[PDB]
Ligand binder design. Structure first.
Ligand code: HEM
Ligand code: HEM
Ligand SMILES: Cc1c(-c2ccc(Cc3ccc(OC(F)(F)F)cc3)cc2)[nH]c2cc(Cl)ccc2c1=O
Lengths: 52, 49, 105, 60, 378
């Protein structure tokens, strides 16, 4: 019941902080793919594809 | 001039002049607890941002 | 003058130069190991001598950090090194031994 | 700005999220580059000794 | 305000690692204590992955280790890392002890004694580990150490039989040695927590030997980066041993299966016990030899009592420095002698080295301290 956080200030703060959250999500995704050696995604990358 | 300032302008100017800058520090008196210069310098940015 | 005293003076001067604490600008009493007696003796010092001791120790620690030594003209002279912590430590030890002697009875 | 390091700072190293993204991408490419280089050097030093060099003789 | 300084759990870490005041001039010799923190954890990791493939049965122990070497994926790397980590641990440990002895760190009596306990525990763990492969040297080292307690009068045979769990070294001995080897590192880590705890109250020492409250700096970022550099150098040396000379510090004879009947003619222990093996061979007497072996290790507990100098550290004490390096050379001499057969002239050299060792520790160091006290006129 977190209804305290519905106002102009919080949507403004969310707008400010969206890009950093997206970049951290991208960092997590790329790290997971690199760590697991997931061939499904990596086979489409041009220079990486030659390692298989 | 004052009426033309908004949140975006303040953010950009402050990021220009404060963020990740080397400051100058002066202390006088019982200042044994003043942090080291490396700690003050590292406090000028955030890892979350 | 005594020949034995001359040999003792020569050996003491040689050992003073060999110890090497003078190269960091310290005095002999700066290098004493601090225990309860020495802690009380240092606590009894006047202001100027205490501040001089603090600065000398701080400079020596910085030189030790940087692996340097002073130039040869700033080294402490053996003849001018006069002990400043003698009477205070002497009196503190005297009082402690008096307390022990009373405790024996 | 003309200098390469100034461009790298103003483009990538300001934020920390971009710093981390740069690090992971660099690791991803550096893995393949280093592996190929090391394998090439090791194969050249020991030419005519490894199994893959004498493999063609026996298998039809 | 700051969660780091008020959270119940992060406050301990903040006061232990991040905001700790440390001296500004501690040299590289202070890194070894941190390195012993790393190596221990390393042995806990690699060893924990060897326990997933090891079986303690006497008929299937050598075979299990060879299965680990040959069949497990990258198992040879883990095996030889765990094998050489012992040598790295003991090098770091002896450097730690020498650092404490040279710079007068033994005046912290509690930390010094807890360290002596840690030294004994680590020695026991290293010895019990070397038996699990079940080769020749494993068998004939377990036999000798277990018989070492037979010298105690009136209870020796019973204690020997109880430790063996039988009339000889056999399956029960191997199984219980495996259990103790598994469990003892956790006790070592628990005691090391106390080793740190007793040092937190008094602060750390510096090479000058003078109190350094005037010059202090935070532990982070200054000694975290030095810790990283020291860890990197340690990993370099360990991997050099693992990848370019896997059997330099080992023994060939432990690659044969254990034979209860035969004995090799050139038995010797690992390189980090040979000095004790040099002392015990010197005395031609069983109880006397065992007592000399015990006292050569337990003499570190009496080091604080023999201090007689006005200056804490040997930085300003040339005679003490000369005697210290003579002691180190004598330990090297004993380590050289322990790897040789008992024959002329090595017997005389070993006896003289042991006499010199005890005389240097007990007699000459306090005498030099008193002489230096008289030279400085105090
Ligand atoms: C301070 C911690 C430790 C030290 C100094 C140590 C030392 C040793 C040594 C010197 C060996 C002989 C290796 C050889 O000669 O090939 C060994 C073997 C072994 N250790 Fe440890 N060890 C430690 C912790 C552990 C732990 C925590 C475990 C398991 C949980 C473990 C499991 C084993 C096993 C299974 C072997 C026999 C397998 C082999 O020969 O490689 N060790 N250890
Ligand atoms: C597994 C065993 C051990 C571990 C993990 C360990 C770890 C540490 C650590 C982390 C420190 C603080 C950092 C430093 O001063 O370098 C330290 C300090 C110290 N340790 Fe150890 N240590 C061990 C064994 C020993 C032994 C065997 C001794 C002595 C016989 C000893 C005596 C000392 C002393 C005196 C200090 C304080 C040094 C000073 O500040 O003057 N420790 N140890
Ligand atoms: C004296 C001696 C040793 C020897 C063994 C161990 C040590 C050190 C030690 C001492 C005690 C210890 O247990 C304790 F820590 F107290 F729990 C663990 C290790 C020193 C020497 N090991 C040999 C091994 C072979 Cl194969 C043959 C002969 C010898 C030989 O004559």
């Amino acid at each position: 019941m977190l209804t305290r956080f519905l106002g102009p200030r919080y949507r403004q703060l969310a707008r400010n902080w969206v890009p950093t959250a997206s970049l951290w999500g991208a960092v997590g995704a790329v790290g997971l793919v690199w760590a697991t050696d997931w061939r499904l995604i990596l086979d489409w990358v041009p220079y990486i594809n030659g390692k298989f | 001039r004052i009426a033309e300032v908004d949140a975006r302008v303040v953010r950009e100017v402050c990021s220009k002049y404060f963020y990740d800058q080397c400051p100058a520090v002066a202390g006088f008196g019982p200042i044994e607890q003043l942090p080291d210069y490396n700690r003050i310098r590292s406090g000028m940015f955030w890892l979350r941002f | 003058v005594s020949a034995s005293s001359r040999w003792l003076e020569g050996i003491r001067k040689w050992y003073y130069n060999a110890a090497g604490f003078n190269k960091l600008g310290l005095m002999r009493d700066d290098t004493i190991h601090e225990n309860d007696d020495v802690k009380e003796a240092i606590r009894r010092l006047p202001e100027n001598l205490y501040n001089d001791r603090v600065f000398r120790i701080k400079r020596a620690l910085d030189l030790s950090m940087r692996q340097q030594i002073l130039p040869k003209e700033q080294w402490t002279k053996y003849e001018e090194d006069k002990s400043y912590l003698e009477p205070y430590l002497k009196e503190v030890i005297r009082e402690r031994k008096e307390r022990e002697e009373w405790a024996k009875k | 700005a003309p200098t390469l390091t100034a461009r790298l700072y103003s483009l990538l190293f300001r934020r920390t999220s971009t710093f981390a993204l740069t690090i992971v991408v660099g690791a991803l490419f550096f893995e393949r580059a280093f592996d190929q280089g090391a394998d090439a050097i090791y194969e050249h030093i020991n030419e005519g000794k490894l199994w893959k060099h004498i493999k063609h003789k026996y298998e039809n | 305000t700051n969660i780091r300084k008020s959270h119940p759990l992060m406050k301990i870490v903040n006061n232990a690692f991040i905001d700790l005041p440390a001296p500004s001039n501690i040299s590289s010799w202070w890194n070894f204590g941190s390195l012993l923190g790393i190596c221990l954890i390393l042995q806990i990791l690699t060893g924990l992955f060897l326990a997933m493939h090891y079986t303690s049965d006497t008929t299937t122990a050598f075979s299990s280790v060879t299965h680990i070497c040959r069949d497990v994926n990258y198992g040879w790397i883990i095996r030889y890392m765990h094998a050489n980590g012992a040598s790295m641990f003991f090098i770091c440990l002896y450097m730690h002890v020498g650092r404490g002895l040279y710079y007068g760190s033994y005046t912290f009596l509690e930390t010094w004694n807890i360290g002596v306990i840690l030294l004994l525990t680590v020695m026991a763990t290293a010895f019990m580990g070397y038996v699990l492969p079940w080769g020749q040297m494993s068998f004939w080292g377990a036999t000798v150490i277990t018989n070492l307690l037979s010298a105690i009068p009136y209870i020796g045979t019973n204690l020997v039989e109880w430790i063996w769990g039988g009339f000889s070294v056999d399956k029960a001995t191997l199984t219980r040695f495996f259990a103790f080897h598994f469990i003892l590192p956790f006790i070592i880590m628990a005691i090391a927590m106390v080793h740190l705890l007793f040092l937190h109250e008094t602060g750390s020492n510096n090479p000058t030997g003078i109190s350094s409250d005037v010059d202090k700096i935070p532990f982070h970022p200054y000694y975290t980066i030095k810790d990283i550099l020291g860890a990197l150098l340690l990993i370099l040396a360990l991997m050099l041993l693992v990848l370019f000379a896997p059997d330099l510090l080992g023994d060939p004879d432990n690659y044969t299966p254990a034979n209860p009947l035969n004995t090799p003619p050139h038995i010797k222990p690992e390189w980090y016990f040979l000095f004790a093996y040099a002392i015990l061979r010197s005395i031609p007497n069983k109880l006397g030899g065992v007592l000399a072996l015990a006292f050569s290790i337990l003499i570190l507990a009496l080091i604080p009592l023999l201090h007689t100098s006005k200056q804490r550290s040997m930085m300003f004490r040339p005679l003490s420095q000369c005697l210290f390096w003579a002691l180190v050379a004598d330990l090297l001499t004993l380590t050289w002698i322990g790897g040789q057969p008992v024959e002329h002239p090595y017997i005389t050299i070993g006896q003289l080295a042991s006499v010199l060792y005890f005389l240097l520790i007990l007699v000459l160091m306090p005498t030099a301290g008193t002489i230096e006290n008289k030279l400085l006129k105090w």
